[PDB]
Amino acid sequence: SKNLFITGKAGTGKSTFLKYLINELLFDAVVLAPTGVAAINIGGETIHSFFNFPINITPDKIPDLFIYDYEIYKYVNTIIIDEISMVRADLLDCIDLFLKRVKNPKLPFGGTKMIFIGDLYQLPPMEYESPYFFSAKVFKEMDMEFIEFETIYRQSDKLFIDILNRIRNNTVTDEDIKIINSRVQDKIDNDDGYIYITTVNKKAEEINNQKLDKLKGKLYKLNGTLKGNFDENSLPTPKNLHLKIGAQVMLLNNAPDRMWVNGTIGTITNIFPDEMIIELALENGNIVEITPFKWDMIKFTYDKKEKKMLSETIGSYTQFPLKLAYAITVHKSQGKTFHKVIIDTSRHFFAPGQFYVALSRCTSLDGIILTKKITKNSIIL
Ligand SMILES: [Mg+2]
């Protein structure tokens, strides 16, 4: 029974379709994701919580890993892992190794049927050949179906989408190494409307708190409420939300009236905390009214009464779906596009391919700025 890899985009569809899947059709399946935020966005459990993995988990640490509940996995026969590109090679082998301990040890993933959901950009054809998931030892042991389901479109408006797919296979050409330098500015208009892309959370938090500190409006300090058991390492936005008028922010939910999507940029025009309203102006002019938003933290549990897997809500987090959007790391911007992005090379290191993902996060390459030149062998993925 083959497993499945599919290439699906983080739309509202995916999230609710997965709920229908594992509630109305499948009763022996769960939905995992690599980080906490990624897990709450789609209503799943993080891989680490589902397996009670310590934070520094590694394949050799597995044989002697303590197991809280040997029984839950006996009832789990299909595992869906979303945002598969954010899973490390060694982590996927830990999952395989783990399943083999609790489930049938002679088969890959203990015999569990595995479904992987990734992005159009991250795709495949004793020591690891790369940190990316397709370099897991367990890919050797098994065969998969490949569905490029959401391949009928992409996340860029311009015609030279081709350039992204041209440096994919190291075929980045001299003829098209320029224009790629044409975007090398010297940043005369600092910075309005551009989000900086970085590699280190430290320096992204530094640029964010730079811009906020200079804005001369009063400082507002919005406090979200945590109920029950909610991991404070998976807050989509800080519990101490610091904001001012004029702040350049990002939206962290998908509007139901399709007025915005996770990643949309805006500017705060008013803050009214007694009424629990933040007003912001979008890029296309429209002013919106943002009220707080409740995220649910799930833990899968087997209901012995009904003989099906249930998503049991173990906590909640209520805060305004916003965070400072002057800067973000390449990792924390996984499902977002943006329109005005700054990729500084002078600061921030971008190993070729970390640099590619960066480029993969601007609607158009006209809304891009760089610092230094770009050669043909510095794009050798
Ligand atoms: Mg099933």
Author numbering: 20 to 144, 156 to 411
Paper text:
Pif1 is a DNA helicase belonging to family SF1B of Superfamily 1 (SF1), which unwinds dsDNA with 5′ to 3′ directionality. Pif1 is involved in DNA repair and is necessary for the maintenance of mitochondrial and nuclear genomes integrity, in the regulation of telomerase activity and in the replication fork progression. We were able to crystallize the helicase core of Pif1 from the thermophilic bacteria Deferribacter desulfuricans and Sulfurihydrogenibium sp., which are moderate thermophilic bacteria, living at an average temperature of 65 °C. Pif1 from these bacteria are named DdPif1 and SsPif1, respectively. The helicase core of Pif1 from thermophilic bacteria is very similar to other bacterial Pif1 structures already solved. The HC contains the features of previously described SF1B helicases: two RecA-like domains 1A and 2A containing insertions 1B and 2B, respectively.
DdPif1 apo crystallized in spacegroup C2221 with one molecule in the asymmetric unit and DdPif1 in the complex with the nucleotide analogue AMPPNP crystallized in spacegroup P21212 with two molecules in the asymmetric unit. Only DdPif1 was solved in two different states, apo and in complex with the ATP analogue AMPPNP. Structural changes upon nucleotide binding are moderate in the absence of ssDNA, as already observed for BsPif1 and ToPif1. The main difference is the folding of the N-terminal part of DdPif1 (residues 1-20). This N-terminal part is not visible in the DdPif1 structure and may be disordered. Since we observed that the N-terminal part is not visible in the DdPif1 apo structure and contributes to nucleotide binding, we hypothesized that it could flexible. Therefore, we analysed the structural changes of DdPif1 apo in solution by small-angles X-ray scattering (SAXS). The molecular weight of DdPif1, estimated from I, Porod volume, and Volume of correlation (Vc) is 50 kD, which is consistent with a monomer of DdPif1 in solution. Thus, the DdPif1-apo structure was modelled by flexible fitting with DADIMODO by introducing flexibility in the N-terminal tail (residues 1-20) and the linker between 1A and 2A domains. Therefore, in the absence of a nucleotide, the N-terminal may be unstructured and becomes folded upon nucleotide binding.
